[PDB]
Subunit: 415 residues, 4 copies
């Protein structure tokens, strides 16, 4: 309670004149090993298209929305014009991009805002891909064209409160009834669920006692998806607690390609390739910001980029970025050549996100105080990395997928 307590925050141009905030997004200086050499002409055109659009459309508004933990619904039709949704799905009204074209688009979104990327990743590299790989021809033709336009939104429900890392032992049931299925259970952390038109729900078929997948609809009687508050990262992403009580799904809406967790495993493997590319994008952005910031901000009568400790940290981030990118690039190519094991994807995601965590640490301390401000990207990025390091399998779970594959010995279960 003062004369000034109620007053609107001081404008950034007056509050910190020395540096530019992320509204005017930093230029790409993280690309140090000339990555366009590794990209097809079509892939280069997508990279710059996604980037120009994210910097113009999303960067100026992301700070507000991230702070309020609100989703920028108005940005959806643009993201659908970007032709990103539907990744590498061929036909059914999808763009039919290369896995690498999709991967670099993923990074180019994540570079600017990780929530938008997660939004699309969950919608497209999980939601749509599960329909593409596991759906009927009828389902694909019915559901994908619109999903690709972003006229409808998908989400992907696997995780439960009782079942997170231990996904194959999920407890959401699916009971065969007359004319379809009856779904019962509870799902947790499902991004988009609070407004998704389509909800791919993984439920245990109670006849076969194996895991099946079902396309649930928005507003189905017995369905309730509600917002998870107080997240420190991915604040624009709407993560849902879902309740299903005798939610009905007709025969035609069961995914025929999901007959046990082995198929969910096959989806997650391809999905982990796309998730790997999020930390790559984020790291690229953090460096870009850090690079500009350090050159702009002056202390002790010199740019902050003049000091040894600041340079060592800047180059450490820079090396991490080149390696991560190449790491993610190889992964894509392994997939394309049809020779990719789940262990290779797990390691891709585990390793990359670990080095990204490291990179965000350094990038965060490099901006000093402003490094904790959403305004300057890094804080946002630093916070957004944490759940990414957790989802699509934790670091520990992913390294054990690889460890099992590389050694021949499962090491998940307790003594």
């Amino acid at each position: 309670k003062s004369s000034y307590f109620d007053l609107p925050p001081m404008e950034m141009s007056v509050a910190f004149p020395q540096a530019t905030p992320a509204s005017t997004f930093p230029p790409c200086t993280s690309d140090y090993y000339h990555f366009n050499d590794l990209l097809t002409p079509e892939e280069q055109a997508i990279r710059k298209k996604v980037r120009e659009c994210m910097e113009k459309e999303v960067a100026p508004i992301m700070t507000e929305y991230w702070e309020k933990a609100e989703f920028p619904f108005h940005i959806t039709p643009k993201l659908g014009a970007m032709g990103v949704a539907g990744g590498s799905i061929k036909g059914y009204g999808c763009p039919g991009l290369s896995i690498t074209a999709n991967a670099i688009a993923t990074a180019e979104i994540a570079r600017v805002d990780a929530s938008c990327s997660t939004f699309i990743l969950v919608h497209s590299s999980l939601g749509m891909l599960t329909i593409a790989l596991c759906g009927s021809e009828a389902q694909k033709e019915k559901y994908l064209p619109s999903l690709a336009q972003l006229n409808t939104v998908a989400c992907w429900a696997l995780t439960e409160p009782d079942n997170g890392s231990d996904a194959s032992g999920l407890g959401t049931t699916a009971t065969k009834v007359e004319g379809g299925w009856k779904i019962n259970g509870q799902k947790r952390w499902i991004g988009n669920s609070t407004f998704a038109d389509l909800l791919i729900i993984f439920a245990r078929n109670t006849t076969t006692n194996q895991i099946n997948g079902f396309i649930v609809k928005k507003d189905a009687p017995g369905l309730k998806a509600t917002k998870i508050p107080n997240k420190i990262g991915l604040r624009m992403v709407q993560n849902g607690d879902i309740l299903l009580q005798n939610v009905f799904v007709p025969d035609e809406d069961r995914l025929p390609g999901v007959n046990s967790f082995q198929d969910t495993s096959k989806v997650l493997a391809v999905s982990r390739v796309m998730v790997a590319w999020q930390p790559i994008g984020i790291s690229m952005g953090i460096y870009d910001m850090c690079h500009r910031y350090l050159k702009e901000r002056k202390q002790f009568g010199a740019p902050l980029a003049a000091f040894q400790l600041n340079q060592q940290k800047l180059v450490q981030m820079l090396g991490n970025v080149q390696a991560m990118f190449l790491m993610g690039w190889r992964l894509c190519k392994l997939y394309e050549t049809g020779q990719m094991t789940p262990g290779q994807a797990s390691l891709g995601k585990a390793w990359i996100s670990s080095k990204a965590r490291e990179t965000a640490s350094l990038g965060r301390e490099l901006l000093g105080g402003n490094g904790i401000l959403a305004d300057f990207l890094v804080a946002k990025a630093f916070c957004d990395l944490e759940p990414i390091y957790t989802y699509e399998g934790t670091y520990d779970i992913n390294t054990l997928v690889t460890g099992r594959e590389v050694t021949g010995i499962a090491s998940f279960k307790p003594a």
Copy 2:
């Protein structure tokens, strides 16, 4: 848009039944090296006292205020009843506690909530202490009785946009006028500055060319303090941008004991010990949460505590924590005996600060998904640590303070 988009969040007890959230604070398990042995009877009594008060009064409401970036004003008299504000200042209405007493109280506050400790710390171990050291006996008798009971609040303005790490090159001017002084300049990041009744403004005396100190008042004409938004950590702390335009301050509100920057470094050495104790407590709280969570939460039919990977992470935290306490404790003992150099104070704050960053990182990934949720503390703590790692000297600035002392060569300025 949905029939359930607007609905309130699911109750945590139904949302995630397995683990209990921070609103019911975890028991102390972090204290593995029986630290009460290093505490005197009245030092123990205070540890107990603040602990209970923080768990009962602050824990149940800290989630929602932190999320909304609001200060919990209703909580301030309860903190004033604890008799911790005023620190080690003898007399003048203050508690006259030992340095070690002040330190674990700083830790036990930070254990539950870092924002609250920061508020107290800038108020008591910066605001009140500069009055207690650099003040006249008059300034002591007038402001200190009210500041100790928390009936009035203090802040401490050194940092500004152009001068943060280079505090010595402070730009804010102080022209001499009859009756007193006019303050012209700008400050930034100042904790409590939006509602502080007293604002200790550091400004350059244009007559002597040196930095001085001025107790400016709330609602002084020309003075505007405005909240800094979009912080990722220390969200309840009201850090401000301060505009000073011809701000009048009479002869009696100037601090007679600060005629040079040298005087501010004298104070900053003592504060850097209290600040060193923030990460200690925060890290204790993190281990405390983690210990209980890993025992409650089951995965693959076992508690999360049963897994090698988790036990290692938890044990690394434990070790870190013991070492951090011992480090801070010796830092108090060096102060108590009048042999503490600034380098010693800096090493402590740097080292402890760093190991906390490491501890929080481990703690955060130990909780999986829920580790990003403020409701479970470790997410709050993980974020709160970043600012703490940065302010009162960055890790780098502090290390080069020690570096200069121990090699005789200053390495702050560039080539």
Copy 3:
């Protein structure tokens, strides 16, 4: 072949004039937090006495011996004059030191040479202590006084080719025979064993199927112990493969206090406190050496200590040292007060080990090329830490000992 190939190496004063080799041992600048304040006047006396002797007697010759992987037998009587061997054993011709005194001398020995410390450690803290804690009055008086003078050397044989980390399941058998026992099996890695007078051999008593302990004598029929070659660290220590072929040990030389692994486990805990002081010692040595080296060595027109990067590495070391020391210190008091658990000793030894590794790594790179020369200590110290990080239980085994204790759930056995 060359006209200079066979010529002796260049003298250090000529080959590298700028910096002093370890032969003139550096002054103690690692003690930054004034550690004598935590020691009794007796504890201070020993620290000093043990340093004076290590610097004068061992430093000038330790390089030549560490390179040839040889033990300096002539050094033995000088070590037994220090009054170290025996440790905390009360009576029976032992010095009856405090636990902290025995801990400090270990650090001061390890500070100059780690091999020398490991010699004394295996001898006094493992070998002699086993006779104190599990021996009978008869054999305590028979063997201990000679051991404390170092007129005779002891070793401690637990590890086997098949049982290192899994010591509880050892396979060396001890067959009850008229008038004593017959020992059969192999031991690996036993320090001093190639010249030890007393070999404490742990073997499975074939009547009870539990581990027992036996005092075996040098040159006993069926005993042969050979050096382990090609060691990168602790190269002065004579580690042996012991082959035991029907070795006769009479009823009088069976330790009546060892009746299962629980007794040998009781011993390891007290020993791990002393081992924990070794990396403390070594890290002090590395710092002391680096500090002097960065002031003497000059590059780009200034002392290496002038550079931001070097100063930070040095300060990081300095921070670790102070924390490691306090950690070892607190651990001693825990033991002195009868409140030490095995899990507390395991934490000390795990954490301090890990911190030393970090320190040595930093310390090694700081000296550039000379950082890989035994002459300049760091290289020797750096290598020596590696087996210390492994023996007395690996970092992982010790982590899980603490792990099991704090969680109450064992996590050693596989999935």
Copy 4:
């Protein structure tokens, strides 16, 4: 003294029968991202030839030689027959391999023995290359053919006691006299120098004040090279202190293409790509050995590979190896494409080197006790990695080479 003290060590098959030592070299499992996909068929063939030669000829003999710190001269005609010496030099009796061809060759040599690698690299990528890039046709035709056959050995002398990192400022002098030059000064750390036939000595022309390069011959009047003893890594490489007192060098032996430091600095960037590949090779070997050791060695009734903690380490190493290779591979393509900058070569060398250090650290602790024995490779490579992390420019110096380039500000010089 003992009846068994002078006996030879126990043969490994009886000492530790559970695991196979490096003398029988492990199969390649570190190639997890199918690296041959990124190599030309010529490059795959070279990779194959070198690997089979190193495993057959060097692995069975390396342990004894590394421990004695002696060079295996008898291996020279084999290494010569591999067709590596000469690297990418086209013509003049050299094999004219591609850049990646020489890179993978480097790695495969280093994979088995780092000393052998450094031997060839200093001879080929420094000695021979300096003549190719900076020699006259007359001296290229005269010296290279025999050098490519290893019938003569070259070395490359830049460093001196007073100039290591600051190489630009060396004090070795070249005075113009009738018929040629007289070289005066001292050199340190020069590999192959005790037996090298040709010695490329860099010395400051006294007329022009710039660094020049001179082909000095073995046993030249005034030349004395002596072995630097007591190294902990690359123990097989013969590094020298070189003494030059009025060493005469004829006009025809002055490299006419070396006129200032920027000529030698241009060579350093090309050879720095090759050095980068040394860590890549070594890490692969470390992984390869670990993989096999962890499957073979049983403890607690399971392979060491069965335990979470061990799998995590193993997978972290594997992640690193993939990233390092891709990193090294990309660097080669940047050079092949003619677009490499010093900063990029510096970044590669710095980053890859640091990752290899982390890897060696993990691989070392994964083998327990035996991880300190040269017999099981890991120990040797761990140690070998330290000089590699230091030479060809340090981590600090290399990072600052990139820092200067990306930021535009040099930060080598002190305040």
